[PDB]
Amino acid sequence: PAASAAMQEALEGAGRIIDRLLQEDRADLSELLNVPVHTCPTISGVSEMDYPLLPEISAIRRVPLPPELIEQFGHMQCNCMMGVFPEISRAWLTIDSDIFMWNYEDGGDLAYYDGLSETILSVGLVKPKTGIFQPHIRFLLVLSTPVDIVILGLSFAGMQLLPDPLYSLPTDNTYLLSITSTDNGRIFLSGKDGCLYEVEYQARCRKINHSDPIVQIAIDNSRNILYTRSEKGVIQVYDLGVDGHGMSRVASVSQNSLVSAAGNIARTIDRNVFKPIIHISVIEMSESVNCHLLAVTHTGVRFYFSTVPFKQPTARPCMLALVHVRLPPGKPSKVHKALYNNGVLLMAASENEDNDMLWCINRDSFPFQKPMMETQVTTQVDGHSWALSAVDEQTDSPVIIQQHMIPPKRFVLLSAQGSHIFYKLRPVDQLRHLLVSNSGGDGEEIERFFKLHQENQACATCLILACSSAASDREVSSWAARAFFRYGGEAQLRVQGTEIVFSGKHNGICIYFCRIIGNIWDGSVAVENTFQSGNREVTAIDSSVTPQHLESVLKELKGLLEFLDRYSQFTA
């Protein structure tokens, strides 16, 4: 009883800390960038604290462009273009009339296609519109030549491209500059005369015009808002309606209107640093319901732009109003290509004509800092950056709570010399290298990382390795727990009523546990599912939890029991 009652009291206080932390864990890019209202832009990127700053990127593994391509490069005298297709681990290199597509992972699967007589000018990949093609046709390759648009089916056994195009249509003597698509398989093309066109197909295909050559079409299939940009920095916003089959222009802003508003906001900057506008990019709602556009300037001015009034999540796009301007570190110059993903911004700059510098900034270091901080670094890369893509893998809490299950993240950069993969190391791999260099669980750098991450979270990230089981860490392990024992501090009674501050260890293990499972601390044990068994609806009560995830959760819990046990005697 008194035992069981104290146990209930425990589980309760535990869940109390757990809900406290999870609530904090839901806690926006808006409330990050300190922009109070949809109309009240602010700026960051000027004070050293914003960049108050331990390897952050993995060391680059190179990979040479497969020899066959360095061979064929002798025959391209008209033109050449190279793009990266992430979803299929592929690169596409068009010589004037022909396409070559290779396995960008290791240079295999060189497939060629020479069925075009005139110069291919733009290329697109499309996931086919549901049920329109038979099931072997995984994707559609759209090619754009000075005369026409050609649609070829692409099946996958091995890269299998159908030799006969699935469709042909006239480009109307209008050079197609960019090919793009939204999730449901709508095909958009950018006409060199700045007109946005749509290729509406069914099971049968037609071009249509819905609308300063527009050179980049960004589609956020998370809100069905199509954002487009002209060479003169014209930014046009079109709503596709809630159902996403619509097309209607809703807003537009000119590069000069931008620069003017800018010089109005940041009174001290030479206004030219605002222009021209090199990149637009959709900031998916998943990270921020508020912001719906990021913009990247040649001098790295980073602009945030919104389309609907703040805290109006159902509104399709209505305006194009800037909210906050991000000034760069220091300094970046000649930015000539870029890519953004999940609080990571990479930009390729022309130091020399054949050597590029890659700058990357990210907000990992202090996901809990008001205002936003970020760590950044630049690295050498051989070649003019022809394309810079990310590999798509399979609000969120921040890494500092989910590191106990999810990988450190991989990014891939493509250059004239080849591929360079790198990894954003979670705080885990940080603590790792900090340990492995000093080669022993003691080191002042350890005192530093400890003071940095607010001892409690430290102790947690310490256990994060202190129970790892694969072989490569057996030694590190014995060290790190030593560390957890040394730098976590000591329990003491804080006399204010007297409040107890459990040592970074206690709350740390608590947080570790909750981070292990957490959501089931309050969630349902069972949920009624309904299956349409023919002409009869069947109610079953199925587990709220699935097996495989439960197996993993167990395994980790077992681990926690193990460490808890091995330390059980040592705490008394």
Binding site: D106, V436, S469, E475
Partner: protein, 117 residues
């Protein structure tokens, strides 16, 4: 301990299987993750101290292990020709500090290939 040894054994079995197949990059990734052989100078000392606790069946293989690793990285500078340097350096330094007489012809191939780059 045992469980570890077992898992590592299956793993390295896969590793050498791939190696014999020649999907080199795979093997590279495998060893890389396996964090046994140092591959960048600063790791060396740490990895080396580990040997003074590594269980036997590993030790029995460590020779062919290092051999294949350096053969791979060699082929890497080969294709890049036809970091790698600093990695090779970490490997050779490991070989030196290692409190265990590797075989002779082992040391022979190691030194020769370390030169030929």
């Amino acid at each position: 301990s045992i469980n570890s040894t077992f898992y590592l054994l299956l793993d390295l079995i896969t590793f050498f299987d791939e190696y014999h197949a020649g999907h080199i990059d795979l093997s590279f990734d495998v060893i890389e993750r396996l964090k046994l052989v140092p591959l960048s100078q600063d790791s060396v000392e740490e990895r080396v101290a580990a040997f003074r606790n590594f269980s036997d069946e590993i030790r029995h293989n460590l020779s062919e292990i290092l051999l294949a690793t350096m053969n791979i990285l060699f082929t890497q500078y080969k294709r890049l020709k036809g970091v790698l340097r600093s990695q090779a350096r970490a490997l050779i330094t490991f070989a030196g500090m290692i409190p265990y007489r590797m075989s002779g012809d082992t040391n022979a191939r190691l030194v020769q290939m370390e030169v030929l780059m």
